[PDB]
Design a protein around this ligand. Structure first.
Ligand SMILES: [Mg+2]
Length: 291
């Protein structure tokens, strides 16, 4: 029997929940099923990593390269100008999510295009990452560690850059066997220098597409019919569209930004909404009762 009232992690002021009885019933399904039926499906940028530290804005995977020493101030100016004009579309109240698709395709293509120009070697991503200002959410050793310990599938599904992501987690010591990473991976020329990106593009609004194109992975996990989903965008709610069967799914959303404009919508679509929150402790607390 689950009582949110008696879990101190749910009493923190950043936790918003439209439907506490509904959430208690989902978590109770999670606990009943135990390890055998659990899998995690998760975004990375701003979900597993922090949106801010010590008054400062934290880098996305892409930002790690934008900001590194192999990239010119004139490239950074251009990249900023793309952010300006395209982010305004991303967040445009009037356009339907579907209308923003071609815009997003353009933005990520152009900005990946500028990085291919800078000449980024694979051999160098280790150092770039080590020198960067990236940070994982408080509680990440525990999150990943209980999950590896119990062999729980973790599907990290990212519109970032996959080589960067994987380097972050490897240097954190948490890129264990149970962790599968699906992202935009770089394509290297025979000098081991970035020439383009592999596969089809994952951006913020089309994770339905990628989720259905990973059927292999999901059908292997048919028995894992209890899911915990973690994201920070509305688009991350699509990340479970490929799952074989669902008995219980819990959806946890990081509302980092645009709090007043988006609270009602986030509270409406995510089960738990974590407001300006830089830790994984609510999810860790669920893992502790479940595992
Ligand atoms: Mg994200």
């Amino acid at each position: 029997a689950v009582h949110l009232k008696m879990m101190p992690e749910f009493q923190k002021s950043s936790v918003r929940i439209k439907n506490p009885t509904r959430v208690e019933e989902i978590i109770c399904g999670l606990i009943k099923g135990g390890a055998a039926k659990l899998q995690i499906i998760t975004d990375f940028d701003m979900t597993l990593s922090r949106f801010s530290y010590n008054g400062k804005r934290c880098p996305t995977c892409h930002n790690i390269i934008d900001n590194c020493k192999l990239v010119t101030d004139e490239c950074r100016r251009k990249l900023l100008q793309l952010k300006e004009q395209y982010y305004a579309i991303e967040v445009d109240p009037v356009l339907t999510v579907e209308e923003k698709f071609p815009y997003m395709v353009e933005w990520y293509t152009k900005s990946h295009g500028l990085l291919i120009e800078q000449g980024i070697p694979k051999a160098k991503l280790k150092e770039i990452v080590a020198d960067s200002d990236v940070m994982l959410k408080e509680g990440y050793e525990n999150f990943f560690g209980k999950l590896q310990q119990h062999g729980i599938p973790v599907f990290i599904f990212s519109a970032g850059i996959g080589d960067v992501l994987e380097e972050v987690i490897r240097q954190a010591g948490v890129y264990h066997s149970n962790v599968k990473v699906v992202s935009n991976f770089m394509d290297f020329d025979e000098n081991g220098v970035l020439k383009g990106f592999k596969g089809e593009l994952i951006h913020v609004f089309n994770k339905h597409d990628g989720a259905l194109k990973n059927t292999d992975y999901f059908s292997q996990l048919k028995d894992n019919s209890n899911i915990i989903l973690l994201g920070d965008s509305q688009g991350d709610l699509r990340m479970a569209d490929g799952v074989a069967n669902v008995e219980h799914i819990l959806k946890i959303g990081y509302l980092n930004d645009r709090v007043d404009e988006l609270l009602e919508k986030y509270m409406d679509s995510y089960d738990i909404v974590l407001v300006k929150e830089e830790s994984l402790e609510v999810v860790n607390s669920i893992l502790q009762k479940t595992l």
